[PDB]
Design a protein around this ligand. Structure first.
Ligand SMILES: Nc1nc2ncc(CO)nc2c(=O)[nH]1
Ligand SMILES: Nc1nc2ncc(CO)nc2c(=O)[nH]1
Ligand SMILES: [Cl-]
Ligand SMILES: [Cl-]
Lengths: 267, 267
């Protein structure tokens, strides 16, 4: 029996900041209602055009939300999106069990150790830039699969050297602008995702209505749900163990079909 | 450059039968608007519980609709779903360029010759039953891929013997109840669809909200669009050249993503 994918539901937190906390719990409950396995909280955007926020601002955004979710939804599994060691440290103390670092441990030399001194998992994503805030850039590649594979191999090596065992390391190839503002490279990584299973780590991907799904029609975000379903399903077909998404209900259901296709006949 | 899938939009025609014809043209135009490449007309259901209709009743349903579409939408490519030679013959005379036979040429010994004496393509579908009206039956298989492959090999041989060249033969493994009321076999055929490319024919499949997509939640038809998108996308990933669907807009868009994943890098 092949296990289904774990669905990671996005809960972004980016005078009146207390109005967000009650609404965050309502949103988290809806994500769980739709079948999310993990609620992913983040207080700092890192897409193109984003700017750096301080650790104090980042904590001020996510800590009230973590506390409220831990109190009202106590069995909910929490992940926190951060590249800052101080933020990861507080998140882990409050009960988060996953840290997702879009810098793959590069932005803060202390973050690996913080996670090493926990029982949390870390997600290491490939990005074409050193700055966790990714750029608009039509980066080309001779062989994006080789580039990303070797990058993730090296980041896994670094995470293990800092004390994180392989079984708490999750790898993400990146998709969309993190890989390139040219969409072809995201499709190539999805095509060859099974090659990354040789690194011995669970795989996490996030098609999530990214602009590489705009296609020939130049589809805006509201029109990218069919493409997000198709990409997330093929990612699972090709070895994804986690899918991060805003559309938990539909992507869970589409991924269940991928799992069923991967299921070998009766033995 | 890998070609995109051809989307086959379903237009079913199953006191006041003249009210259907004007509405059929409106529906056909919408299917084309959404990006269908072929409009598939049929006057006889063949799912579980369906009953046989006469050739005269079948023609009385589809001929006014074909004529109206040929007149109002003259560049639209028309396929007709029929297992009857007489019906196929009239459809071809009126300008249909595809005959889809859910009996794979078994139900009417004259149908192969009718298509041979045309420039139309024929779709040969596998079904577990000889009767084109398929049964409710949880048919089990030792190796459904072997069964279906050998069946389609033999039907291709028969079609060629009757005068239809390979390049006008399209093969469909069947899905849903045509294969089995047990869903596992539909998923297995999707998993192994590329094995059928050895038969040297274009491949046609129709996930189209069939009950094998009901999943663990026992989803009704209204809730099967994410699963239809995922299944149709993986079918294209695995070699489908045609996808037959009611949800042309969404399935076209999901399949475009599958095509992009199949697209090799710059050479
Ligand atoms: N691991 C991971 N994290 C992300 N965080 C933000 C965004 C924003 O688009 N994408 C991703 C992603 O693709 N993978
Ligand atoms: N070739 C083909 N024809 C069909 N006709 C009707 C239906 C009705 O569900 N399905 C199919 C199908 O899966 N393939
Ligand atoms: Cl610590
Ligand atoms: Cl004839």
């Amino acid at each position: 029996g092949m296990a289904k994918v774990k669905i990671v539901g996005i809960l972004n937190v980016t005078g009146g900041r207390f109005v967000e906390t009650d609404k965050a719990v309502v949103r988290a409950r809806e994500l769980l209602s739709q079948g999310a396995d993990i609620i992913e909280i983040g207080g700092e955007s890192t897409g193109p055009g984003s700017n750096t926020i301080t650790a104090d601002e980042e904590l001020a955004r996510i800590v009230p939300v973590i506390r409220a979710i831990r109190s009202s939804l106590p069995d909910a599994n929490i992940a926190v999106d951060t590249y800052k060691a101080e933020v990861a440290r507080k998140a882990l103390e409050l009960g988060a069990t996953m840290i997702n670092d879009v810098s793959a441990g590069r932005a803060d030399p202390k973050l690996f150790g913080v996670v090493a001194r926990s029982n949390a998992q870390i997600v290491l994503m490939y990005s074409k830039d050193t700055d966790p805030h990714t750029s608009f850039d039509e980066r080309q590649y001779v062989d994006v699969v080789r580039t990303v594979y070797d990058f993730l191999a090296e980041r896994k090596k670094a995470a293990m050297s800092a004390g994180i065992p392989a079984d708490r390391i999750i790898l993400d190839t990146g998709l969309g602008h993190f890989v390139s503002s040219d969409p072809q490279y995201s499709f190539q990584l999805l095509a060859h995702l099974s090659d990354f299973q040789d690194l011995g780590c669970k795989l996490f991907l996030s098609p999530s209505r990214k602009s590489f799904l705009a296609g020939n029609e130049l589809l805006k975000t509201a029109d990218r749900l069919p493409g997000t379903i198709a990409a997330s399903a093929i990612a699972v077909l090709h070895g994804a163990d986690y899918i991060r998404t805003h559309d938990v209900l539909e992507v869970r259901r589409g991924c269940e079909i991928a799992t069923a296709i991967n299921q070998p006949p009766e033995r």
